């Protein structure tokens, strides 16, 4: 515990390399994969397998995920909620045996058609998968029964758009995360509302609990998945031209906030936008919805026990990086310390 762990050199070398890449390869990739042809397909053929399996029932599909906010890749999975008997707006705690019996279901269909090959089944998971690979397009498919990625992903694209350096970021420390071998402890989800909370306290982008003042509110159980898609301008939020230098210099900044930051007291909160929120604090800075959730349901408030706490801005009983360990987030602090080295000018 007293040794830092090295960075990994695969790490080390994308990094002492020029960041141009990003810039100039993968955000232009990645922009296309926000929507092809292939998607229509792929949608398609899922109302098409699935229909005949609960035929008077309402189906709808939607596409969220990394393809869709626009920091995928060539072999990004993509992310499909199949709606079936409109249960968007329900909000299960946890996954509900129902729920697993619904996914039990649909596994047949994937297993006796055609156009589909099982990879895997995960019904243990915080959030239970199939796993597929649609044949005709070669596309890995993770298909789910939660709504709320959905819903963050129209978020993220609103940030992502508003504000392209938060995209940028994004791909480089999605990548990173990747290279340094990191993905079994901390998400390219989490990495991104980490980005996302460190613009906020650079007034780059902003609190999320500011997009969400209700006058109306949609909500997914207590949660509330809509926000006010406001003009940055009207916000006095600028919107800076990505360049090489200025993403560099915010990368370098990022990885050295994450390496000093105090994760025993303070967590990563997009919700409030602000620097320094005390996990022992937060709680009651929510709203009446959360406080009204948890009133009733204590057992289903977000866990602050935890080596790290980042917050799900929308799911606000979600500590997104809750499986990280001591030494996952020592790991984590140790190679954002030396990627900050790294990036020195
Ligand atoms: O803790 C989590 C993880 C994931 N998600 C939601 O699930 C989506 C897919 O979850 P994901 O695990 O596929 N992460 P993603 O951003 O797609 O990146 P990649 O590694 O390229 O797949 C994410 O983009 C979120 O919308 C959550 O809402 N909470
Ligand atoms: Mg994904």
Redesign the pocket.
Known sequence: QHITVRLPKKARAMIVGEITNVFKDKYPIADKLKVIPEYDVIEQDLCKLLSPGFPKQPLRVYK???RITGI?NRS??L?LFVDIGNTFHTFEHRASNATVAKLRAMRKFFCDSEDWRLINFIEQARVPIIKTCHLPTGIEC?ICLNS??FC??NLLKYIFESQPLTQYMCIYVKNWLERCKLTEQI???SI?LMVIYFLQLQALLPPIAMLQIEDQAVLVGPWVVNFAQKSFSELGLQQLKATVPVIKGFLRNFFAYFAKFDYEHFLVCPYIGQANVEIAKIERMLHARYSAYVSDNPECSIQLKKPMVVQ?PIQLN?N?TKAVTKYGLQTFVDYCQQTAELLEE
């Open positions: 969220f995920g990394s995928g990004s999975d992310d993770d709320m990625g963050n992903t998400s390219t989800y991104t799900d979600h997104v």
